Design a protein around this ligand. Structure first.
Ligand SMILES: Nc1ncnc2c1ncn2[C@@H]1O[C@H](COP(=O)(O)OP(=O)(O)OP(=O)(O)O)[C@@H](O)[C@H]1O
Ligand SMILES: [Mg+2]
Lengths: 52, 172, 210, 193, 125, 52, 29
């Protein structure tokens, strides 16, 4: 999931709802995760949102 | 006219000094008779080159940070938007009719600040934190930057508590 | 006869002044022609488009990331050309004729200029024989002769390629039935499209036989 | 009027002053008195910071800037071409154009002694006869009564022959490229048969 | 340490010009700014022409002074890739922004590459 | 000498009608840009202008 | 480098040579 210039609240919502879905696993079971998140959300300067 | 041909002009290539030695003994007497017509030179301070449209172009200011409060000698604040190679473009927080070409621009050394704290509670301030309610300066207060970056994903949590508007259509 | 008639050309040089956004401004290159292929020393080609008094503006045929300030750009002496001939049939080339289908070099082909003066009044004759599209809304209502430019205009996803593809596919069906003199050889130029869209079209054209 | 022809045609507004400076110094036969007086002034800006304040500081008044320059250049036998140029560049605040005029004054001067520079890259260092046979090749690459100086470098990536580099063109009569220009001719011709 | 370490020449918002005294960085190279409060990397966008590069800041530029030392990393922005990046949150420059420690990486790939070639496409629906 | 302030009034010395200029900006190089309150026809470069 | 302030000139006049030619030509004998 590349979040490019959207809400940071929505980045926190997806991240938290993937932890309770088991899509993201934290700690020593990190390797059993299925999703990686890249976030360049709408508070970033326009260079960071142009490359994320 | 490439810089390969221009950086050869660093090293001396005259081999004849009949005008270097002459004007080096007449230059300092020449400058000394024109000193009440020189404005004092400016390196870490600033001097206004152009003012108009609410943007000042400031010569000098060798060590302004990008986006910091500069102070004109009129007392007006500015903010160094673009640092250019030759000038600094500042945007004037106030009326530009009181800034002239030739005015000193002083550096405050801080990116743009407002007073924050408990003592700003109760007050009517302007766009820069200077109070306009007439009841004194802000006390019990400290300066904070106005362009803080928002907290990231891990610094947040879900929205759980209600903010009651008191408006019936809204809170329902 | 080649070795007894052989002098190497002088290659006129140029230095890259500035480079960015696929444009290189070049100092020098004083004998470059307008519209001439240049060659950067990074291997990437270029075309000299506006010859100003102080620099040359070069549009870069490729990624401008390999060009630095002060790089050597050499002129090739030639206006921009592509390989023409029957060896281009069946091949998928790029915008300068270099083949991108991975089937080796273009054999049986000849380099000709891409900017040719169009044939004038005395070189024409009347468009009289039909080009059959195979699309019956076209061949009945808006029929197309041989030597006629016809616009396919419309919004997105309205079937403009499908009218064009069916003209190409139908020529294959017609080329198997006519004598050798009147066979239509199609060229499809795909500008600015996806590469997946183009690989779907050469898959259709291989499967149909077109 | 009638001015001499400048040898080179150059760019504008600083190279255009230098070709006017060359033309009044070619009329007066002062082509090297004016040149080293430029070279003195290049050195004069390096040592005196108040002389280069008369070229960078925009708050120097123009009545000061033209009176410091005139009252300093009134003696020491400067060319009348020079002290008229320097009050003209101080009238308009163009004293910072002077590094760029001096560079273009050089290119007009070096194309007046048709001396053209060079670089010859060979495979191994030359003989004294390999030197003499090579200029006979190389002065047929300068198209007038020009003299080539030379600069000799070596590269065994070349298999004999030479590469003449003139800083605006090169000519490669080395046999390392004559191999490649031979191979691609016969790699093109067997595909044409 | 002197050459291939340029200095900030002008700052206009997100766009920084750095002047390099010799050996300019390539276009798309990453440039670190020394002495900033946060890690400020700059991606080289243009060569301006007088030993100056024009580059884009990946973070805020409020605080940049016109002499600030800029080191070149000699490569584009390179981010951690692999199966070690799964379950992590990264920002634009590959830093973890989820406070879960450093991202162990199979490789560190630059974020700039070309498209796959025409022979590399797959036409299946 | 010293420039007039922005919005200052300038009177042009010697002109058929009283011409009043209002200073709009400081252009640099000791020049101000002014908007005229009357017609500028008949105005000569180098005419004296008095700052009020 | 102390001469690097003068490497890039910019002028207040597009017609600078038309003033320079009005002072260099009467320097000729
Ligand atoms: N004659 C037709 N009959 C049935 N379906 C059609 C016909 N023409 C096109 N289509 C369908 O409509 C879609 C749009 O067609 P097409 O790709 O030709 O449009 P286009 O004008 O090329 O659009 P664009 O180039 O903007 O994507 C295609 O998926 C095609 O399958
Ligand atoms: Mg289409």
């Amino acid at each position: 999931f590349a979040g490019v210039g959207e809400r940071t609240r929505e980045g926190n919502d997806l991240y938290r709802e993937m932890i309770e879905s088991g899509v993201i696993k934290l700690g020593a079971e990190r390797g059993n995760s299925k999703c990686t998140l890249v976030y360049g959300q709408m508070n970033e300067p326009p260079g960071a949102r142009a490359r994320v | 006219a490439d810089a390969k041909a221009l950086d050869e002009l660093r090293k001396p290539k005259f081999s004849s000094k009949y005008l270097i030695q002459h004007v080096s003994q007449k230059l300092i007497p020449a400058v000394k008779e024109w000193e009440k017509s020189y404005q004092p030179p400016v390196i870490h301070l600033g001097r206004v080159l152009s003012v108009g449209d609410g943007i000042a172009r400031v010569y000098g200011l060798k060590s302004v940070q990008a986006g910091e409060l500069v102070c004109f000698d009129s007392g007006v604040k500015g903010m160094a938007l673009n640092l250019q190679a030759d000038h600094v473009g500042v945007v004037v927080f106030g009326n530009d009719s009181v800034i002239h070409q030739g005015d000193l621009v002083y550096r405050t050394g801080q990116i743009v600040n407002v007073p924050i704290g408990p003592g700003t509670l109760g007050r009517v301030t302007d766009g820069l934190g200077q109070p306009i309610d007439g009841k004194g300066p802000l006390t019990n207060v400290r300066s904070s930057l106005v362009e803080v970056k928002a907290p990231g994903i891990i610094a947040r949590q879900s929205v759980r508590e209600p903010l009651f508007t008191g408006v019936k259509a809204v809170d329902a | 006869e080649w070795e007894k008639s052989y002098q190497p050309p002088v290659i006129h040089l140029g230095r890259v002044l500035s480079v960015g956004d696929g444009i290189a401004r070049v100092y020098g290159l004083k004998s470059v022609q307008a519209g001439e292929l240049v060659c950067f020393d990074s291997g990437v080609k270029g075309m000299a488009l506006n010859l100003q008094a102080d620099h040359v503006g070069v549009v870069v045929f490729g990624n401008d990331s390999v060009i630095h300030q002060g790089d050597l750009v050499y002129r090739t002496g030639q206006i921009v050309n592509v390989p023409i001939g029957p060896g281009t049939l069946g091949r998928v080339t790029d915008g300068l004729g270099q083949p991108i289908d991975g089937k080796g070099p273009l054999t049986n082909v000849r380099s000709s200029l891409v900017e040719v003066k169009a044939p004038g009044i005395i070189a024409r004759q009347s468009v009289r024989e039909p080009l059959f599209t195979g699309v019956k809304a076209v061949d009945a209502l808006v029929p197309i002769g041989r030597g006629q430019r016809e616009l396919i205009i419309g919004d997105r996803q309205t079937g403009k390629t499908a009218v064009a593809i069916d003209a190409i596919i139908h020529q294959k069906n017609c080329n198997e039935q006519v004598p050798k003199a009147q066979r239509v050889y199609c060229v499809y130029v795909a500008v600015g499209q996806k590469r997946s869209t183009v690989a779907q079209l050469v898959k259709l054209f291989t499967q149909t036989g077109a | 009027l009638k001015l001499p022809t400048a040898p080179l045609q150059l760019s504008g507004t600083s190279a255009q002053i230098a070709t006017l400076l060359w033309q009044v110094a070619a009329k007066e036969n002062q082509l090297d008195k004016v040149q080293d007086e430029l070279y003195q002034f290049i050195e004069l800006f390096k040592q005196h910071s108040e002389l280069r304040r008369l070229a960078t500081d925009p708050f120097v008044p123009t009545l000061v800037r033209t009176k410091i320059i005139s009252s300093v250049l009134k003696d020491s036998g400067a060319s009348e071409i020079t002290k008229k140029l320097f009050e003209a560049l101080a009238d308009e605040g163009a004293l910072s154009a002077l590094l760029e005029v001096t560079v273009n004054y050089e290119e007009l001067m070096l194309a007046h002694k048709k001396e053209v520079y060079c670089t010859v890259i060979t495979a191994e260092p030359l003989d004294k006869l390999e030197r003499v046979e090579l200029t006979k090749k190389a002065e047929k690459f300068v198209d007038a009564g020009f003299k080539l100086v030379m600069q000799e470098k070596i590269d065994k990536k070349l298999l004999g022959g030479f590469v003449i580099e003139f800083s605006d063109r090169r000519v490669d009569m080395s046999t390392a490229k004559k191999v490649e220009e031979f191979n691609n001719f016969v790699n093109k011709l067997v595909l044409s048969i | 340490p002197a050459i291939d370490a340029g200095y900030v020449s002008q700052v206009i918002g997100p766009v920084v010009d750095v002047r390099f005294d010799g050996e300019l960085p390539s276009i798309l190279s990453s440039l670190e700014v020394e002495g900033h409060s946060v890690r400020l990397v700059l991606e080289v966008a243009q060569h301006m022409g007088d030993n100056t590069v024009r580059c884009i800041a990946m973070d805020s530029t409020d605080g940049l002074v016109r002499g600030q030392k800029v080191v070149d990393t000699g490569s584009p922005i390179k981010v951690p890739v692999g199966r070690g990046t799964l379950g992590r949150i990264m920002n634009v420059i590959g830093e973890p922004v989820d406070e879960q420690g450093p991202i162990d990486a199979a490789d560190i790939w630059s974020i700039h590459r070309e498209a796959p070639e025409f022979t590399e496409q797959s036409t299946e629906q």
